[PDB]
Swiss-Prot record:
Full-length numbering of the shown residues: 30 to 340 of 1274
Species this chain originates from: Homo sapiens (Human)
Tissue expression summary: In testis, expressed in polar epithelia and Sertoli cells but not in vascular endothelia. The protein is detected in stomach, duodenum, pancreas, liver, fetal brain, carcinomas, lens-forming cells, fibroblasts, lymphocytes, lymphoma cells, erythroleukemia cells but not in endothelium of vessels, epidermis, intercalated disks, Purkinje fiber cells of the heart and lymph node.
Intracellular or extracellular location(s): Cytoplasm, Cytoskeleton; Cell junction, Tight junction; Cell membrane; Cell junction
Repeat region (HEAT), residues: 2-35, 38-72, 75-117, 123-162, 197-234
Name of the featured protein: Symplekin
Length: 304
């Protein structure tokens, strides 16, 4: 049979299956319309996205991953899929929400890059407004009652901060992120996307992450310490804020966790020390490392 004949057959079968083997069918459809004949992707979105209402948590997670795959193949499909992603971000099941956060961590920066590289249509403008509101909703999930949602939100917020601040000449950018958009590549006179608002949004997101640090679990705290170390190295204009946050933590959780948290904090502070932007703050970082009980030998080794 032809590829589209096989896709129709599979989708019809998936609609009748009453257990998670329907995911096996949908993954076969995904391979056929994303990889075998990518021109079919557009033709079958409605049929796959219909499964977003399925009672199975695993099926709804599959639909979020499919949205991510579809937008990775063709970012213009975000016009057709962002509202569906928004509904999944609002799911009552926390594992579906966590997956939606993971996907937004991948998709927000790709959406922004598309808006900037694009003249921008009314549909793109409306799409952007929704992406921006969804990003804002994930910042609010730093206050989730669910521990795992908070951890996922921290990593989304880390990405948001870095995306919405400029690269510096001493930024240490992970290879995997070398091609990602950053604020320095957003024009000041774009017709819809407002550079000043994005600058303020990145700063405000950092403020939220710093407020978060004083709310949370040990894993939330150490995830945030690590995100802050990444921010300081990737966006060294925030070095001061990060060091101040670390100083605040140390000056102020079950006491049993202190050794573990302090070890993590030492490791991240040492990683910040190793970056050449730490020079301005060397005395400050040094004093803190000593007060955290870091041996002189270890401090010297982690100099830039």
């Amino acid at each position: 049979m032809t590829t589209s004949e096989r896709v129709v057959d599979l989708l019809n079968q998936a609609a009748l299956i009453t257990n998670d083997s329907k995911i096996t069918v949908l993954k076969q459809v995904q391979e056929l319309i994303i990889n075998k004949d990518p021109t079919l992707l557009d033709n079958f979105l409605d049929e796959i996205i219909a499964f977003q209402a399925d009672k199975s948590i695993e099926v709804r997670k599959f639909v979020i991953g499919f949205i991510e795959e579809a937008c990775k193949r063709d970012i213009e499909l975000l016009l057709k899929l962002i509202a569906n992603l928004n509904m999944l971000l609002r799911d009552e099941n926390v594992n579906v929400v966590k997956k939606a956060i993971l996907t937004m961590t991948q998709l927000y920066k790709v959406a922004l890059q598309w808006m900037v590289k694009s003249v921008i249509s009314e549909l793109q403008e409306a799409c952007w407004d929704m992406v921006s509101a969804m990003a804002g909703d994930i910042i609010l999930l730093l206050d989730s009652d669910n521990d795992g949602i908070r951890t996922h939100a921290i990593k989304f917020v880390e990405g948001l901060i870095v995306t919405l601040s400029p690269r510096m000449a001493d930024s240490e950018i992970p290879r995997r992120q070398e091609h990602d958009i950053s604020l320095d590549r957003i024009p000041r006179d774009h017709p819809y996307i407002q550079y000043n608002v994005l600058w303020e949004e990145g700063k405000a997101a950092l403020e939220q992450l710093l407020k978060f640090m004083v709310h949370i679990s040990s894993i939330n705290l150490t995830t945030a310490l690590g995100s802050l170390a990444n921010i300081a190295r990737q966006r060294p204009m925030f070095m001061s804020e990060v060091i101040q946050a670390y100083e605040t933590l140390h000056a102020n959780l079950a006491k049993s966790q202190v050794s573990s948290v302090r070890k993590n904090l030492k490791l991240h502070l040492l990683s910040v020390l190793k970056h050449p932007a730490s020079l301005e703050f060397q005395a400050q970082i040094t004093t803190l490392l000593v007060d955290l009980g870091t041996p002189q030998a270890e401090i010297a080794r982690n100099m830039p």
